[PDB]
Design a protein around this motif. Structure first.
Motif, PDB file in Angstrom:
ATOM      1  N   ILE A   1      83.362  65.147  23.016  1.00 52.42           N
ATOM      2  CA  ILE A   1      82.728  63.884  23.380  1.00 52.42           C
ATOM      3  C   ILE A   1      83.660  62.718  23.079  1.00 52.42           C
ATOM      4  N   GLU A   2      84.064  61.996  24.122  1.00 51.92           N
ATOM      5  CA  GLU A   2      84.920  60.821  23.961  1.00 51.92           C
ATOM      6  C   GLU A   2      84.065  59.553  23.957  1.00 51.92           C
ATOM      7  N   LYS A   3      83.244  59.451  22.914  1.00 50.91           N
ATOM      8  CA  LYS A   3      82.450  58.263  22.629  1.00 50.91           C
ATOM      9  C   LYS A   3      83.231  57.294  21.741  1.00 50.91           C
ATOM     10  N   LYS A   4      84.483  57.637  21.426  1.00 56.64           N
ATOM     11  CA  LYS A   4      85.354  56.754  20.655  1.00 56.64           C
ATOM     12  C   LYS A   4      85.670  55.469  21.412  1.00 56.64           C
ATOM     13  N   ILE A   5      85.760  55.536  22.740  1.00 51.86           N
ATOM     14  CA  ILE A   5      86.018  54.355  23.556  1.00 51.86           C
ATOM     15  C   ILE A   5      84.685  53.716  23.928  1.00 51.86           C
ATOM     16  N   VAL A   6      84.199  52.809  23.076  1.00 44.40           N
ATOM     17  CA  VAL A   6      83.039  51.971  23.363  1.00 44.40           C
ATOM     18  C   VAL A   6      83.323  50.558  22.880  1.00 44.40           C
ATOM     19  N   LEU A   7      82.471  49.627  23.311  1.00 41.85           N
ATOM     20  CA  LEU A   7      82.536  48.245  22.839  1.00 41.85           C
ATOM     21  C   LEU A   7      81.500  48.041  21.731  1.00 41.85           C
ATOM     22  N   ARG A   8      81.795  48.644  20.580  1.00 39.78           N
ATOM     23  CA  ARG A   8      80.999  48.491  19.369  1.00 39.78           C
ATOM     24  C   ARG A   8      81.833  47.789  18.308  1.00 39.78           C
ATOM     25  N   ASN A   9      81.204  46.857  17.591  1.00 45.15           N
ATOM     26  CA  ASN A   9      81.857  46.142  16.496  1.00 45.15           C
ATOM     27  C   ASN A   9      82.061  47.123  15.347  1.00 45.15           C
ATOM     28  N   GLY A  10      83.275  47.656  15.249  1.00 45.56           N
ATOM     29  CA  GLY A  10      83.576  48.738  14.335  1.00 45.56           C
ATOM     30  C   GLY A  10      84.412  49.801  15.018  1.00 45.56           C
ATOM     31  N   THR A  11      84.781  49.541  16.268  1.00 42.80           N
ATOM     32  CA  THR A  11      85.601  50.441  17.064  1.00 42.80           C
ATOM     33  C   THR A  11      86.922  49.777  17.443  1.00 42.80           C
ATOM     34  N   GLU A  12      87.915  50.612  17.735  1.00 40.28           N
ATOM     35  CA  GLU A  12      89.235  50.135  18.126  1.00 40.28           C
ATOM     36  C   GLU A  12      89.394  49.995  19.635  1.00 40.28           C
ATOM     37  N   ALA A  13      88.374  50.365  20.414  1.00 42.35           N
ATOM     38  CA  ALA A  13      88.362  50.029  21.832  1.00 42.35           C
ATOM     39  C   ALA A  13      87.809  48.630  22.069  1.00 42.35           C
ATOM     40  N   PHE A  14      86.934  48.157  21.177  1.00 41.54           N
ATOM     41  CA  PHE A  14      86.477  46.775  21.250  1.00 41.54           C
ATOM     42  C   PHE A  14      87.549  45.809  20.761  1.00 41.54           C
ATOM     43  N   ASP A  15      88.438  46.267  19.876  1.00 36.22           N
ATOM     44  CA  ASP A  15      89.524  45.409  19.418  1.00 36.22           C
ATOM     45  C   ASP A  15      90.557  45.171  20.512  1.00 36.22           C
ATOM     46  N   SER A  16      90.801  46.171  21.365  1.00 37.76           N
ATOM     47  CA  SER A  16      91.735  45.981  22.468  1.00 37.76           C
ATOM     48  C   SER A  16      91.144  45.090  23.554  1.00 37.76           C
ATOM     49  N   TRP A  17      89.821  45.110  23.711  1.00 37.52           N
ATOM     50  CA  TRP A  17      89.181  44.346  24.776  1.00 37.52           C
ATOM     51  C   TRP A  17      88.911  42.899  24.371  1.00 37.52           C
ATOM     52  N   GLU A  18      88.578  42.657  23.099  1.00 44.89           N
ATOM     53  CA  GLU A  18      88.416  41.286  22.615  1.00 44.89           C
ATOM     54  C   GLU A  18      89.746  40.545  22.619  1.00 44.89           C
ATOM     55  N   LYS A  19      90.801  41.202  22.140  1.00 42.56           N
ATOM     56  CA  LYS A  19      92.139  40.619  22.076  1.00 42.56           C
ATOM     57  C   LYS A  19      93.114  41.626  22.674  1.00 42.56           C
ATOM     58  N   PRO A  20      93.566  41.417  23.910  1.00 40.26           N
ATOM     59  CA  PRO A  20      94.541  42.335  24.522  1.00 40.26           C
ATOM     60  C   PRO A  20      95.907  42.198  23.873  1.00 40.26           C
ATOM     61  N   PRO A  21      96.411  43.262  23.237  1.00 47.70           N
ATOM     62  CA  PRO A  21      97.658  43.132  22.468  1.00 47.70           C
ATOM     63  C   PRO A  21      98.912  43.155  23.319  1.00 47.70           C
ATOM     64  N   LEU A  22      98.830  43.646  24.550  1.00 48.25           N
ATOM     65  CA  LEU A  22     100.009  43.839  25.377  1.00 48.25           C
ATOM     66  C   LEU A  22     100.197  42.631  26.282  1.00 48.25           C
ATOM     67  N   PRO A  23     101.394  42.043  26.350  1.00 50.55           N
ATOM     68  CA  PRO A  23     101.579  40.825  27.146  1.00 50.55           C
ATOM     69  C   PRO A  23     101.523  41.098  28.641  1.00 50.55           C
ATOM     70  N   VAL A  24     101.201  40.048  29.392  1.00 52.55           N
ATOM     71  CA  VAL A  24     101.101  40.108  30.845  1.00 52.55           C
ATOM     72  C   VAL A  24     102.146  39.167  31.423  1.00 52.55           C
ATOM     73  N   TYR A  25     102.985  39.689  32.315  1.00 47.31           N
ATOM     74  CA  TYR A  25     104.095  38.939  32.889  1.00 47.31           C
ATOM     75  C   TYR A  25     103.802  38.630  34.352  1.00 47.31           C
ATOM     76  N   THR A  26     103.816  37.345  34.695  1.00 44.90           N
ATOM     77  CA  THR A  26     103.526  36.879  36.042  1.00 44.90           C
ATOM     78  C   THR A  26     104.728  36.103  36.556  1.00 44.90           C
ATOM     79  N   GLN A  27     105.244  36.508  37.714  1.00 52.22           N
ATOM     80  CA  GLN A  27     106.380  35.842  38.336  1.00 52.22           C
ATOM     81  C   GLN A  27     105.931  35.163  39.622  1.00 52.22           C
ATOM     82  N   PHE A  28     106.018  33.838  39.633  1.00 57.88           N
ATOM     83  CA  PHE A  28     105.586  33.015  40.752  1.00 57.88           C
ATOM     84  C   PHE A  28     106.694  32.922  41.791  1.00 57.88           C
TER      85      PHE A  28
END
Ligand SMILES: *[C@@H]1O[C@H](CO)[C@@H](O)[C@H](O)[C@H]1NC(C)=O
Ligand SMILES: *[C@@H]1O[C@H](CO)[C@@H](O)[C@H](O)[C@H]1NC(C)=O
Lengths: 40, 40
Positions: A1-28
């Motif tokens: 059961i992969e219930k590890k990926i949820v948006l619960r306060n106490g999970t590390e999948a909610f930490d990635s979604w609240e604050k995305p750690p990986l930068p986003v590069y946009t070239q105009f």
């Protein structure tokens, strides 16, 4: 059961979604008009 | 002795030089200005 990926306060999948750690590069890209009066 | 090629009236090298029998093909290439006001 992969219930590890949820948006619960106490999970590390909610930490990635609240604050995305990986930068986003946009070239105009632009278009420069070379013959502007000839279009008119 | 290759004295056959001379410009003497009675020779076939003078006949080629007075009247060239082989056609000459000339192809005229032009340049078309795309942005004429922008050069001004
Ligand atoms: C998440 O962490 C604790 C869990 O109870 C809570 O005090 C805190 O306010 C929560 N954060 C948000 C934004 O709800
Ligand atoms: C060439 O051919 C004969 C050779 O005497 C002559 O009658 C003729 O006039 C000559 N042509 C020219 C252009 O001199």
């Amino acid at each position: 059961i992969e219930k590890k990926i949820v948006l619960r306060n106490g999970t590390e999948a909610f930490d990635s979604w609240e604050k995305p750690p990986l930068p986003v590069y946009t070239q105009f890209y632009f278009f420069n008009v070379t013959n502007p009066e000839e279009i008119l």
